[PDB]
Amino acid sequence: NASGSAILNVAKSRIGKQYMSGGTGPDLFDCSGLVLYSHNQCGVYGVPRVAKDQARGGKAGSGAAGDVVYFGNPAHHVGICCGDGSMVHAPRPGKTVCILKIAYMKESYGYRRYY
């Protein structure tokens, strides 16, 4: 899906940006801030701010490019799906935005879709 790929492309563009608690871009990000930025930049409105809410909003996803992957219920971490088993995410303070295999989180996960 083209909107999904667009959200992914915006997330990828942020690879290398520093983590900051409270960051939603363009230069500094937390996990949910990267999700929010990536959607807003593509005109995909309606996305909430914090991870636990992003995990509950929208519709069920499949893990396709641009879906939101969330970790936990209630969720404490999120990323943007690449569509291949990996995600773009802002990991934690002291890391930069990067791609990680979703399996490497070693915890429960699901998918939402906002586009």
Author numbering: 23 to 137
The study reports:
The final model of TvNlpC_B3, refined to an R/Rfree of 0.158/0.170 (full data collection and refinement statistics in S2 Table), and contains the contiguous segment from Asn23 to Tyr137. The active site residues of TvNlpC_B3 form a catalytic triad, identified as Cys53, His99 and His111 using homology with family members. Helix2 contains the active site cysteine at the N-terminus of the helix, positioning it in close proximity with His99 and His111. Similarly to other Cys-His-His peptidases, the positioning of His111 appears to orientate His99 for facilitating enzymatic activity (via hydrogen bonding between ND1 atom of His111 and the NE2 atom of His99). This groove occupies a full face of the domain, making it a dominant feature of the otherwise globular protein. The active site cysteine is located centrally within the grove, with the imidazole groups of histidine residues on one side, and the hydroxyl of Ser54 on the other, altogether forming the groove’s floor.
We have recently shown that T. vaginalis has acquired NlpC/P60 genes from bacteria, expanding them to a repertoire of nine TvNlpC genes in two distinct clans, and that TvNlpCs of clan A are active against bacterial peptidoglycan. NlpC/P60-containing enzymes typically hydrolyse the stem peptides of bacterial peptidoglycan (PG). We characterized the 3D structure of TvNlpC_B3 alone and with the inhibitor E64 bound, probing the active site of these enzymes for the first time.
